[PDB]
Design an enzyme around this catalytic site. Structure first.
Site, PDB file in Angstrom:
ATOM      1  N   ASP B  25       0.865  -1.204   0.000  1.00 14.11           N
ATOM      2  CA  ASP B  25       0.000   0.000   0.000  1.00 14.11           C
ATOM      3  C   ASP B  25       0.900   1.252   0.000  1.00 14.11           C
ATOM      4  O   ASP B  25       1.321   1.737   1.106  1.00 14.11           O
ATOM      5  CB  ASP B  25      -0.859   0.003   1.234  1.00 14.11           C
ATOM      6  CG  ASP B  25      -1.914   1.072   1.207  1.00 14.11           C
ATOM      7  OD1 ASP B  25      -1.809   1.924   0.277  1.00 14.11           O
ATOM      8  OD2 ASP B  25      -2.818   0.973   2.076  1.00 14.11           O
ATOM      9  N   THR B  26       1.174   1.797  -1.178  1.00 15.25           N
ATOM     10  CA  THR B  26       1.987   3.020  -1.223  1.00 15.25           C
ATOM     11  C   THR B  26       1.287   4.210  -0.569  1.00 15.25           C
ATOM     12  O   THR B  26       2.038   5.226  -0.294  1.00 15.25           O
ATOM     13  CB  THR B  26       2.367   3.304  -2.675  1.00 15.25           C
ATOM     14  OG1 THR B  26       1.203   3.545  -3.474  1.00 15.25           O
ATOM     15  CG2 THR B  26       3.240   2.218  -3.257  1.00 15.25           C
ATOM     16  N   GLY B  27       0.003   4.196  -0.402  1.00 19.63           N
ATOM     17  CA  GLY B  27      -0.705   5.272   0.297  1.00 19.63           C
ATOM     18  C   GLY B  27      -0.677   5.194   1.794  1.00 19.63           C
ATOM     19  O   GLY B  27      -1.249   6.069   2.452  1.00 19.63           O
TER      20      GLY B  27
HETATM   21  C1  LIG Z   1      -6.830  -1.011   2.831  1.00 12.93           C
HETATM   22  C2  LIG Z   1      -7.182   0.421   3.234  1.00 12.93           C
HETATM   23  C3  LIG Z   1      -6.263   0.941   4.313  1.00 12.93           C
HETATM   24  C4  LIG Z   1      -7.323   1.272   1.972  1.00 12.93           C
HETATM   25  N1  LIG Z   1      -7.091   2.732   2.060  1.00 12.93           N
HETATM   26  C5  LIG Z   1      -5.951   3.204   1.241  1.00 12.93           C
HETATM   27  C6  LIG Z   1      -4.725   3.530   2.078  1.00 12.93           C
HETATM   28  O1  LIG Z   1      -3.531   3.650   1.270  1.00 12.93           O
HETATM   29  C7  LIG Z   1      -4.873   4.798   2.941  1.00 12.93           C
HETATM   30  C8  LIG Z   1      -4.869   6.119   2.134  1.00 12.93           C
HETATM   31  C9  LIG Z   1      -4.881   7.301   3.066  1.00 12.93           C
HETATM   32  C10 LIG Z   1      -3.821   8.192   3.089  1.00 12.93           C
HETATM   33  C11 LIG Z   1      -3.812   9.252   3.987  1.00 12.93           C
HETATM   34  C12 LIG Z   1      -4.860   9.422   4.864  1.00 12.93           C
HETATM   35  C13 LIG Z   1      -5.922   8.549   4.838  1.00 12.93           C
HETATM   36  C14 LIG Z   1      -5.939   7.495   3.943  1.00 12.93           C
HETATM   37  N2  LIG Z   1      -3.766   4.863   3.895  1.00 12.93           N
HETATM   38  C15 LIG Z   1      -3.907   4.842   5.217  1.00 12.93           C
HETATM   39  O2  LIG Z   1      -4.881   4.571   5.872  1.00 12.93           O
HETATM   40  O3  LIG Z   1      -2.711   5.069   5.793  1.00 12.93           O
HETATM   41  C16 LIG Z   1      -2.654   4.918   7.209  1.00 12.93           C
HETATM   42  C17 LIG Z   1      -2.622   3.439   7.581  1.00 12.93           C
HETATM   43  C18 LIG Z   1      -1.315   3.285   8.246  1.00 12.93           C
HETATM   44  O4  LIG Z   1      -0.474   4.222   7.616  1.00 12.93           O
HETATM   45  C19 LIG Z   1      -1.296   5.399   7.699  1.00 12.93           C
HETATM   46  S1  LIG Z   1      -8.390   3.734   2.169  1.00 12.93           S
HETATM   47  O5  LIG Z   1      -7.898   5.076   2.351  1.00 12.93           O
HETATM   48  O6  LIG Z   1      -9.284   3.160   3.105  1.00 12.93           O
HETATM   49  C20 LIG Z   1      -9.233   3.632   0.620  1.00 12.93           C
HETATM   50  C21 LIG Z   1     -10.178   2.651   0.449  1.00 12.93           C
HETATM   51  C22 LIG Z   1     -10.840   2.522  -0.753  1.00 12.93           C
HETATM   52  C23 LIG Z   1     -10.608   3.421  -1.800  1.00 12.93           C
HETATM   53  N3  LIG Z   1     -11.278   3.310  -2.985  1.00 12.93           N
HETATM   54  C24 LIG Z   1      -9.676   4.446  -1.596  1.00 12.93           C
HETATM   55  C25 LIG Z   1      -8.965   4.529  -0.419  1.00 12.93           C
END
Ligand SMILES: CC(C)CN(C[C@@H](O)[C@H](Cc1ccccc1)NC(=O)O[C@H]1CCOC1)S(=O)(=O)c1ccc(N)cc1
Lengths: 99, 99
Positions: B25-27
């Protein structure tokens, strides 16, 4: 381009004449933007994350420029702490993870 | 390995003798796993996401095997709809995004 992941993978986007930044998010199936105006009809959708539910507007066949590359796809509009480019649009760039 | 993003980028992990799958998960700045027992002291932390808040336990210098590669880092334990490997550990694999 090739990028490393010691910093967040943030790119410039252009969508409906508006300029924004977004995170390239391999963990996101779909693209979600907060800070943006799109015209036309949309459909209500829910999507689900660390924290639970976010209600979003799904806009189909939206022209978007990501790091200079023109694509068309679904863009979800809704509250998100960060604008995110998901795999729906990264596959149109031919993006890969490498290690 | 090189992988494309038409499917979720899911890899096998081994952590405290337990086998699981996780999303690359690069995000995600940090790694978060739900379904897992770690021993030793930890610290409370919050992480925000699409949908709001999640209370997690932060476990430092955890040995983990990701797609065959041995690293040590911080692992967050908490509710998450999917186990995710974040950039904290992807940087130890020398992972890159390419398009
Ligand atoms: C498996 C999950 C976690 C998937 N997410 C993606 C993740 O990359 C998510 C992106 C993000 C970045 C910054 C702030 C908030 C969220 N990062 C995240 O929570 O970072 C946290 C977990 C620890 O490090 C910090 S999501 O945001 O729920 C999501 C869900 C569905 C769609 N269509 C789009 C996005």
């Amino acid at each position: 381009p090739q990028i490393t992941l010691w910093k967040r993978p943030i790119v410039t986007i252009k969508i409906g004449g508006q300029l924004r930044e977004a995170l390239l998010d391999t963990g996101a199936d779909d693209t979600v933007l907060e800070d943006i105006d799109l015209p036309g009809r949309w459909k209500p959708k829910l999507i689900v994350g660390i924290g639970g539910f976010v209600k979003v507007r799904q806009y189909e066949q939206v022209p978007i420029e990501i790091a200079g590359h023109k694509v068309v796809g679904t863009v979800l509009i809704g509250p998100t702490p960060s604008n995110i480019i998901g795999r729906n649009l990264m596959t149109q760039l031919g993006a890969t993870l490498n290690f």
